[PDB]
Amino acid sequence: VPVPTGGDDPTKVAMLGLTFDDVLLLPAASDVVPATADTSSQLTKRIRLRVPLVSSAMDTVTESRMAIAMARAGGMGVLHRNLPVAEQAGQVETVKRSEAGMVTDPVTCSPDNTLAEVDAMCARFRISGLPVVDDTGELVGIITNRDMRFEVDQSKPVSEVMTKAPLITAKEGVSAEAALGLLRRHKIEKLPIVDGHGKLTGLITVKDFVKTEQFPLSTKDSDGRLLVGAAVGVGDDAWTRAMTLVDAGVDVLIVDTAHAHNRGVLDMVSRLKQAVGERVDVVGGNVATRAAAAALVEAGADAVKVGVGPGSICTTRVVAGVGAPQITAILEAVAACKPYGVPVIADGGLQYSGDIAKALAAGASTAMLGSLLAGTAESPGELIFVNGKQFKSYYFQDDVLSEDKLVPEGIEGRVPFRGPLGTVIHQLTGGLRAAMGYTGSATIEQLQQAQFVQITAAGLK
Amino acid sequence: VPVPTGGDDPTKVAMLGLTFDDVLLLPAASDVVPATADTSSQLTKRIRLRVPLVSSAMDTVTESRMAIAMARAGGMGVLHRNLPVAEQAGQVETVKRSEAGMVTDPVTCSPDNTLAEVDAMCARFRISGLPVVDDTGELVGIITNRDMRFEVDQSKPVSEVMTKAPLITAKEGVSAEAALGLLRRHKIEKLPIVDGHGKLTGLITVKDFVKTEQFPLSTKDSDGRLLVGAAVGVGDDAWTRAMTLVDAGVDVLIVDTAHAHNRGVLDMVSRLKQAVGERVDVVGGNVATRAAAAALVEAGADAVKVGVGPGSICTTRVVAGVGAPQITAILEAVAACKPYGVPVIADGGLQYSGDIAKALAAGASTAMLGSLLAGTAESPGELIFVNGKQFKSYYFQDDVLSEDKLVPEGIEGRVPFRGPLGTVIHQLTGGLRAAMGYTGSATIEQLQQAQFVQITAAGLK
Amino acid sequence: VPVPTGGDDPTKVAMLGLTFDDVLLLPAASDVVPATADTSSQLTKRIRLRVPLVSSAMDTVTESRMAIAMARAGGMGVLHRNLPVAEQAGQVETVKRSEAGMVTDPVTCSPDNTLAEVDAMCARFRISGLPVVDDTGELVGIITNRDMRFEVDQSKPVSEVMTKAPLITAKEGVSAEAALGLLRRHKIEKLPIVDGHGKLTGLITVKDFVKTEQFPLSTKDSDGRLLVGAAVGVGDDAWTRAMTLVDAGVDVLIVDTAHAHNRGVLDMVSRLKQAVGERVDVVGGNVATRAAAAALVEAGADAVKVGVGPGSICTTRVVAGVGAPQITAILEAVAACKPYGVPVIADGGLQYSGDIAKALAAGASTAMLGSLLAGTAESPGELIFVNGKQFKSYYFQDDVLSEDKLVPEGIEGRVPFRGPLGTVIHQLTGGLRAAMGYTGSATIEQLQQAQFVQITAAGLK
Amino acid sequence: AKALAAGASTAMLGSLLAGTAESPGELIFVNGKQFKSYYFQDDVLSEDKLV
Numbered sequence A, B, C: 001v002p003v004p005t006g007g008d009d010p011t012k013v014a015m016l017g018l019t020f021d022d023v024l025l026l027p028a029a030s031d032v033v034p035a036t037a038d039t040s041s042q043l044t045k046r047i048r049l050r051v052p053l054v055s056s057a058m059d060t061v062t063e064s065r066m067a068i069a070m071a072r073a074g075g076m077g078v079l080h081r082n083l084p085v086a087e088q089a090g091q092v093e094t095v096k097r098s099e100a101g102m103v104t105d106p107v108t109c110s111p112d113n114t115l116a117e118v119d120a121m122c123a124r125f126r127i128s129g130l131p132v133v134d135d136t137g138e139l140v141g142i143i144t145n146r147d148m149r150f151e152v153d154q155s156k157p158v159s160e161v162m163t164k165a166p167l168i169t170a171k172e173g174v175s176a177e178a179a180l181g182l183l184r185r186h187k188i189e190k191l192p193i194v195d196g197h198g199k200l201t202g203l204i205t206v207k208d209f210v211k212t213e214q215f216p217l218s219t220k221d222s223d224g225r226l227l228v229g230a231a232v233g234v235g236d237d238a239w240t241r242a243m244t245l246v247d248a249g250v251d252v253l254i255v256d257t258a259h260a261h262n263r264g265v266l267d268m269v270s271r272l273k274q275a276v277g278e279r280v281d282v283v284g285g286n287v288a289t290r291a292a293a294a295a296l297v298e299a300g301a302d303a304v305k306v307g308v309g310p311g312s313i314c315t316t317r318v319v320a321g322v323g324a325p326q327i328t329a330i331l332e333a334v335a336a337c338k339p340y341g342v343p344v345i346a347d348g349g350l351q352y353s354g355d356i357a358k359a360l361a362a363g364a365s366t367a368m369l370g371s372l373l374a375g376t377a378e379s380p381g382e383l384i385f386v387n388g389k390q391f392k393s394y395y396f397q398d399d400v401l402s403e404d405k406l407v408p409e410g411i412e413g414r415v416p417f418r419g420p421l422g423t424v425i426h427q428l429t430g431g432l433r434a435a436m437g438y439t440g441s442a443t444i445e446q447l448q449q450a451q452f453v454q455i456t457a458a459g460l461k
Numbered sequence D: 001a002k003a004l005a006a007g008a009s010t011a012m013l014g015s016l017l018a019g020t021a022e023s024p025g026e027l028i029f030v031n032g033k034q035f036k037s038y039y040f041q042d043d044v045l046s047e048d049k050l051v
């Protein structure tokens, strides 16, 4: 009649929770070579990554540089929201404008501008070449870096320095092979694209082709632009922020909260899904139970993010006494999401590449990376030397249950330097490929069927 | 036939005991904002606290200053009993006389007293002003701190310094608004209250109204005086101590023993309950099993205190080999006390605010704070500096099973400094409100229904 | 319906894995004296060792010197494969040529050779005596170390220094006692063996009788030569390497891979068994499950080697998240191998002699010793002194799942010195004999039936 | 500054420059730290003989 651990209710202690350190992946029959294993996986219902890694929406992890680097490596970045709406939207714009199959609204100047104005425009948009259009809107020339580097008088007008029409151009609908042939024949880096009337429509650069060859794994939309995501909260400020981000061209909106089994979070997910769901994907915030995942799935989430106090000495566990070991949390959330085709993003608690393999094996489709990327070169911050070691030096945060509320006021900074993002991603992917080879998993979908062995406390000594 | 751990008896090892570190609170469906979470809870069957915390009856934790500070913060203090009966009764009187709606036995002098005598009475009662009455008992004036501060001659009598009658007074039963309006209209801090014959009956001060505004959460009786509790042992000395404390105006008596599953303790609880039950509440000492709690409930205790060797390296565990992990002990005691409506106080083993949340979720109604408050400014002792650090420098104890009977003779002292009490209480309540937000608990009674997840040893690495 | 550790699939967490530190051997009724316990056990179906220990096929552990020392101690060595095929075959020849009952193809010189050429041959083969043969092929004399140490001019020919025929010889089929009598009556160290025509066919030395007396536990074939094993990989290069090693006289082939539950490895084992199985034994790579052991048995393996990520902080566990605790892995593999009489080799995770006893009690027939032997005098490398301490200073590695693929490019070396191999082997065998005395096991086959007790984390504190 | 004050005209810098980016070697990461990786010397009295 009594429960052995106390009391008379068998459900007072609901489950035994397993973390990453409690389990290992068992070897199985394999004909899979690690170099031939396919590591592509679904981020949402409509977005498949080549490398199943996403960078966290933390102000020490993901800004435009990290987002570009992650999308180039085959994953994706989620821009943090600890900043004004205009600044986050501009970061989305920066990521989307990094590269493309064809620039569809290129920056143009007029013949009357000075060279100082053109230099300012180039610095503002981080480009080096501008088509020149007159008051009619007609393309009268093009001014690039070569023309301006040899000029001293910055007050000179553009019409005096630009390469005047007729130019080397192509019509709308020009094939990529023809465009590159025209670029290589005339030994120029730029090719304006014009309509039937000759007015400018677009611009094609050799640099875009070189980037496409240099980063074959890039995460891109149908226009050849890198994908990016951004985080929003709950409220009306958050609704305005979400609409601005959608206008800027974002691909994924993450309703990013500490505790997503809340009616406000679910209403925000449903509102976003009905309002802008045909264009962007909506990812629901952090859950740790089967019921919360099912609630998010009913609300209409395209992916479910999992983890609530997942770390051992997490501030949520110490201060509030709340948590859920991550392996059991992922198993429970997958049990709710998998029947409906909704992917799962494992967020938090990861320390090594073996943890990534374990989390994917438990049923998650992607892993979100935080502290593993905070010290990298692409993460925000300035690089400084202190005593021969290297470090990275640096109104919002309205979530009532975030860890920054639970910690006392003080100081945090000087995260150590970890090097380029490429090496970290290469190491993590190598570990994942080794695990796939051991378990005989040709794909991530097969890895999600692998078996575990539970180890005792003696196995961690 | 054999038990897997040895022997033939399956009841030799009765249970598996869970401590605080073994469990976490699982997130649940919530609409609760931490700021609007109601943290009030029952201390006994008749006393409800705004903050469900009480300070321990230890000579390093609770004296009159700590008790006043705790009752002002919404909790309560229990005065320790490691001191003579007269001194503990004096501390009870000090706490009860700190503030009131109206002072009912005001300190008065006679016109023949010198200013030195009035100064001595002021220092004795820690007040600054006195009404003056003659042998007839008529109110002949009032002498306050303003009159005395400008007198160089200490040897003068009161009749030459006091403000003579007629005074600004009020009738018995005057309302709060009328009394405060009369105080403000005449720009005075004191208002004597007189009967139909004009003989002095009470005193109303502006400082009491200001205190009521300044500490809105204070734990008070119907007269507006702060509540306080005090500990007693067992024996006839303990009976005399209890009667003296009840005379001094104590609100809670705690029969404080290391092992309450004793006929002496139970008979003492029944005796106190029969003699002074209608006036004060009786709390039974520390238990750790369902049977002991049931025995205390039958004896008539108004609250049951839980914990016998709850600390991991406790002296009781090391020296006597006796103990009970606190989560299981709380579950077992609640299983016996809740059907009868007797609240449970969790005493010992608490290190973080998360532990307080876990103890309340296991079924307890209040938590008793020991070492968490010993370094605070309001705890007894003198603050000193040693080596750049701050430390707090400092016949009875008939409990045969207490830890001081187990520990050898030596030196204990110099507890470290921890700052003001209010900051510690604020941190603990913030943790509790975060836990209530995560679990979706609007009240403490709902928090007592929250579920746990048991974690493995790997979750503590 | 739901699994307590998460999800709905009860086989997601397949088992609970036990390591060496989780178990102890229980004392049982014994009449066994440790000195008289029989420690011999099967390495394969056809090879029985006197001491159930084999040295790892690592380039810091086993080369020719270690193989000879292990065979002389009563175990065996396995030569590593991180070197060219010619060098490994040469080390096989070195081990096989160390000692014998009779040298079947003794090295010879000709009367027209210079003493420098004879010195070169002696240095090459590490001998000190050669019979002399003419162009006819008749034995004309013998030149040994005594004849060469007293000649100053190294330019003199063999015919002027050698002892001329007639010599002391014996006919093919001469017994050992007769040959030793011939050696001792004429006070010589060598005895050529000739056929009816008078042609040289063999050689018998006093040194071989002395070695047989000096190392009575040696692991030898029917010709009195030490047994040796060698590691091969998978692929066509591996097939050529294996054929060369077999031609050099190897006794055991070990298909040495990280993950043997692979069709390629199984095919290699079957091919080798079909080709050279009647001469040599083929041992299959590392497995950790019952199914993998059953596959290796079906492939035709003569013994099964067990262990995949067995160490607690193993690189395979951290980087790939893959492993299996060694006690459970051994139990599972033995369940598949014992019905067919296939011995099990426990490889990895051994730290103490008690672990060797536990591995054998779980069902293994032999244990492979790695890092326990890496710093011994007989292990490869050169002994140096650094800061008062003693250290050991020093295209292939094609296995896709080997740990070196997982470790980052970097630096390793300077293993510490651990004394001679004899003391290590003596200590390990002493521990094993004590375990046999405690469990009442006269043979290793009886030790394989002993029981375990599982201990808690407190038992490791 | 002290060396130039004593009368020297220039100072030769050795170990102060050994770890800089322009010095020979390859930059690597080891455990979160950064390091630089890599018949002649016939001088009879050089330190390399003594060590």
Ligand SMILES: Nc1nc2c(ncn2[C@@H]2O[C@H](COP(=O)(O)OP(=O)(O)OP(=O)(O)O)[C@@H](O)[C@H]2O)c(=O)[nH]1
Pocket (backbone or CB within 6 Å): A097, A098, A099, A100, A103, A105, A106, A107, A125, A126, A127, A128, A129, A130, A189, A190, A203, A205, A206, A207, A208
């Ligand atoms: N010219 C131009 N490029 C843009 C614009 N917006 C984004 N880009 C991108 O910026 C890159 C081209 O920038 P530039 O530096 O002017 O190109 P470039 O002169 O070919 O560059 P290099 O080969 O590095 O000399 C391409 O990846 C474009 O897709 C824009 O308005 N104008």
Ligand SMILES: Nc1nc2c(ncn2[C@@H]2O[C@H](COP(=O)(O)OP(=O)(O)OP(=O)(O)O)[C@@H](O)[C@H]2O)c(=O)[nH]1
Pocket (backbone or CB within 6 Å): B097, B098, B099, B100, B103, B105, B106, B107, B125, B126, B127, B128, B129, B130, B189, B190, B203, B205, B206, B207, B208, B211
């Ligand atoms: N005057 C007076 N106050 C008492 C007595 N017993 C308790 N008190 C409390 O002590 C406080 C008043 O102390 P005083 O020092 O006289 O206060 P005050 O001079 O009016 O106040 P401040 O000048 O603002 O400090 C109130 O909170 C009273 O409730 C008593 O006998 N006389």
Ligand SMILES: Nc1nc2c(ncn2[C@@H]2O[C@H](COP(=O)(O)OP(=O)(O)OP(=O)(O)O)[C@@H](O)[C@H]2O)c(=O)[nH]1
Pocket (backbone or CB within 6 Å): C097, C098, C099, C100, C103, C105, C106, C107, C126, C127, C128, C129, C130, C145, C189, C190, C203, C205, C206, C207, C208, C211
């Ligand atoms: N002489 C000789 N010994 C061989 C040959 N091949 C293997 N051996 C072994 O090498 C050992 C003999 O080596 P030697 O040094 O020539 O022997 P020895 O001169 O009799 O020995 P010591 O004078 O006691 O050192 C024996 O163990 C032989 O079995 C060979 O071709 N010639």
Ligand SMILES: Nc1ncnc2c1ncn2[C@@H]1O[C@H](COP(=O)(O)OP(=O)(O)OP(=O)(O)O)[C@@H](O)[C@H]1O
Pocket (backbone or CB within 6 Å): A128, A129, A142, A143, A144, A145, A146, A147, A162, A163, A166, A167, A168, A169, A187, A188, A189, A190, A191, A192
């Ligand atoms: N489509 C075009 N038609 C005609 N002239 C062009 C065209 N595109 C560029 N030019 C001219 O070709 C010249 C070379 O410029 P280009 O754009 O190739 O390089 P850049 O970016 O200016 O220089 P850099 O070599 O520093 O990257 C310039 O004078 C430019 O005006």
Ligand SMILES: Nc1ncnc2c1ncn2[C@@H]1O[C@H](COP(=O)(O)OP(=O)(O)OP(=O)(O)O)[C@@H](O)[C@H]1O
Pocket (backbone or CB within 6 Å): B128, B129, B142, B143, B144, B145, B146, B147, B162, B163, B167, B168, B169, B187, B188, B189, B190, B191, B192
């Ligand atoms: N009820 C009263 N009627 C008439 N005079 C009074 C009354 N109470 C106090 N006084 C007088 O009014 C003056 C101001 O005293 P009050 O009680 O306001 O403050 P205090 O405690 O004397 O001084 P402090 O400003 O230091 O608090 C004194 O001279 C006092 O004697």
Ligand SMILES: Nc1ncnc2c1ncn2[C@@H]1O[C@H](COP(=O)(O)OP(=O)(O)OP(=O)(O)O)[C@@H](O)[C@H]1O
Pocket (backbone or CB within 6 Å): C128, C129, C142, C143, C144, C145, C146, C147, C162, C163, C167, C168, C169, C187, C188, C189, C190, C191, C192
């Ligand atoms: N079978 C033999 N018949 C005749 N003479 C022999 C024979 N074997 C060796 N001798 C000769 O006997 C002498 C001693 O040879 P032996 O083999 O006993 O020792 P060794 O190996 O030359 O020297 P050491 O004494 O250093 O071990 C040599 O001069 C050698 O030529």
Ligand SMILES: [Mg+2]
Pocket (backbone or CB within 6 Å): A128, A145, A189
């Ligand atoms: Mg350019």
Ligand SMILES: [Mg+2]
Pocket (backbone or CB within 6 Å): A189
């Ligand atoms: Mg260029």
Ligand SMILES: [Mg+2]
Pocket (backbone or CB within 6 Å): B128, B145, B189
């Ligand atoms: Mg005053």
Ligand SMILES: [Mg+2]
Pocket (backbone or CB within 6 Å): none
């Ligand atoms: Mg005042």
Ligand SMILES: [Mg+2]
Pocket (backbone or CB within 6 Å): C128, C145, C189
């Ligand atoms: Mg010899």
Ligand SMILES: [Mg+2]
Pocket (backbone or CB within 6 Å): none
């Ligand atoms: Mg000799």
